Every structure is written in C-alpha cells, then in structure tokens.
Amino acid sequence: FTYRGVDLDQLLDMSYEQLMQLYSARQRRRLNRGLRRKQHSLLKRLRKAKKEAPPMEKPEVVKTHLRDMIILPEMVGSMVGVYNGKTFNQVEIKPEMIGHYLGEFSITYKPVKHGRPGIG
C-alpha cells in the first residue's frame, strides 16, 4: 500500500502532524481543530483491543456510535462496529480507507427494490 509515497510503517511511526498533512483539507479541518474526549476514548479502547488480540486472530469487536470519527492509520486491521442506527454493523479496516470516515462503510438504509405502482 502507498499513501502520498508513504507506506503503513512510516504512517504509524510518523508524528500526528505528518499524518495530518497527507489527508485532504477536509480531514485537516477537523484534525487541526483537535479531536474530542468521546473520540480519544474510542481510540484508547481500540488500542487495548488490538493489544490484547491473539497471535493470528483479529482484536475483539469494539462497537461504536461514532460515524463522524475519522479513521486514523492506527485502526488498520481493527474490527470496528459502526452504528447504522438500527443495528451494529461489521467493519474491517483495510489500509486503503485510512482517509475515509468510519461511517460511510455502514450503509444508511436498505436499498430500494421497486415493485408495481398503486392507486392514488
């Protein structure tokens, strides 16, 4: 994988500002403004989930209601439950989505399957 001519090793090991600089201006807008309490908490709990993980097995499912939370490169490989609003849904973080919002992976809705119209 490559992000701005930079791999996953350098990304993780890079300081937070050097992570910030390669994201678009939109991610930079929410990052330079800082990340909040309820987000640093989820960051910390996915850390403890990834650290307690078995050798070949992926960390314990950490459920979350934060769709708006940006995906840091440190969640790569971590199982994230994203709340669609009915049901906790199953997200598996890959390296390509490190720029995207956690939310969009969880669909908002059931896709419309049409049928014949009716009297009105």
Partner 1 sequence: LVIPEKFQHILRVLNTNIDGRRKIAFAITAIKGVGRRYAHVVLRKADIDLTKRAGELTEDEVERVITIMQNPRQYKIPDWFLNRQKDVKDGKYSQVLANGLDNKLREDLERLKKIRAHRGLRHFWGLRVRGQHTKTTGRRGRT
Partner RNA sequence: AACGAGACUCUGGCAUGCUAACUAGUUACGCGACCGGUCGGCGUAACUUCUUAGAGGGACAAGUGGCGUUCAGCCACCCGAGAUUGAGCAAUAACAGGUCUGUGAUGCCCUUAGAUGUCCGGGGCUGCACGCGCGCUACACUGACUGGCUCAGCGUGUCCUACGCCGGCAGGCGCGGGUAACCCGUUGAACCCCAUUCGUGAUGGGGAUCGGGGAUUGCAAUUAUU
Q: How far is the C-alpha of 70 from the C-alpha of 58, rounded, in Å?
A: 21
Site string for RNA, 35-54 (x = CB under 7 A): -x------------------
Q: Do 22 and 1 meet the contact criterion of CB atoms below 8 Å apart?
A: no
From the list partner 1, RNA, none, partner contacted by residue 70 (C-beta under 5 to 8 A by kind):
RNA
If one counts every other C-beta atom within 10 angstroms of the C-beta of residue 46, the result is 21
98 touches RNA by CB under 7 A: no
Q: From the CB of 87, what's the least distance to RNA, in Å? A: 9
Q: Which amino acid belongs to residue 8?
A: L
69 touches partner 1 by CB under 8 A: no
Binding span for partner 1 by CB under 8 A among 31-39, 46-54, 69-77, 99-107: 99-107
Q: Do 64 and 91 meet the contact criterion of CB atoms below 8 Å apart?
A: no
- Among 8, 22, 53, 66, indicate the residue that binds partner 1 (CB under 8 A): 22
What is the greatest pairwise CA distance in the chain?
63
| Residue 67: DSSP 8-state | S
Binding site for partner 1 (CB under 8 A): 2-6, 22, 94, 96-97, 99-100, 104-105, 107-108, 111
